[PDB]
Amino acid sequence: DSYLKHQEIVLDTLLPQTVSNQWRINNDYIRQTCTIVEEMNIQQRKQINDLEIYRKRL
Amino acid sequence: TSMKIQFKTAMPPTEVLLESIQSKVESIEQLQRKLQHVQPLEQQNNEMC
């Protein structure tokens, strides 16, 4: 029974190692998405300026 | 005569064991059941990793 508790503890440590790494892959992705948000939002704001300006000039 | 002597000696050695072993069989088998859930959580985490 003491042998089984040592084996069972090794599985739980592998669960934390995978959990720590999958959070890290998500954490790197979250910073990229926020930066891709502002680049798309600035692109949309510049586009809405150009559509309004071209009608105003004509 | 042997089935009288040995099996009554067997039932005494079993029930004296089963008062002690079936408590620690449940300590063994329920900890075996923790392994089959720690393995199933390991595969879906390694798949998501």
From Swiss-Prot, chain A:
- Subcellular localization(s) per the UniProt record: Nucleus
Protein role: Involved in pre-mRNA splicing by stabilizing the NTC (or PRP19-associated complex). As a component of the NTC complex, associates to the spliceosome to mediate conformational rearrangement or to stabilize the structure of the spliceosome after U4 snRNA dissociation, which leads to spliceosome maturation.
Something else the entry says is: Present with 721 molecules/cell in log phase SD medium.
Known partners and oligomeric status: Belongs to the NTC complex (or PRP19-associated complex), composed of at least CEF1, CLF1, ISY1, NTC20, SNT309, SYF1, SYF2, and PRP19.
* Annotated protein name in UniProt: Pre-mRNA-splicing factor SNT309
**Gene label:** SNT309
Could you say which residues of the full protein are shown? 118 to 175 of 175
Swiss-Prot record, chain B:
Q: Superkingdom, according to UniProt?
A: Eukaryota
Subcellular localization, as worded in the UniProt entry: Cytoplasm; Nucleus
Query: What does this gene product do?
Result: Involved in pre-mRNA splicing and cell cycle control. Required for the binding of the NTC complex (or PRP19-associated complex) components to the spliceosome to mediate conformational rearrangement or to stabilize the structure of the spliceosome after U4 snRNA dissociation, which leads to spliceosome maturation. Its absence leads to an arrest of the cell cycle, possibly due to the inefficient splicing of TUB1.
What more is known? Present with 784 molecules/cell in log phase SD medium.
The record's comment on protein family reads: Belongs to the CEF1 family.
Q: How does it assemble?
A: Belongs to the NTC complex (or PRP19-associated complex), composed of at least CEF1, CLF1, ISY1, NTC20, SNT309, SYF1, SYF2, and PRP19.
Protein name according to UniProt: Pre-mRNA-splicing factor CEF1
The UniProt gene name for this protein comes to CEF1
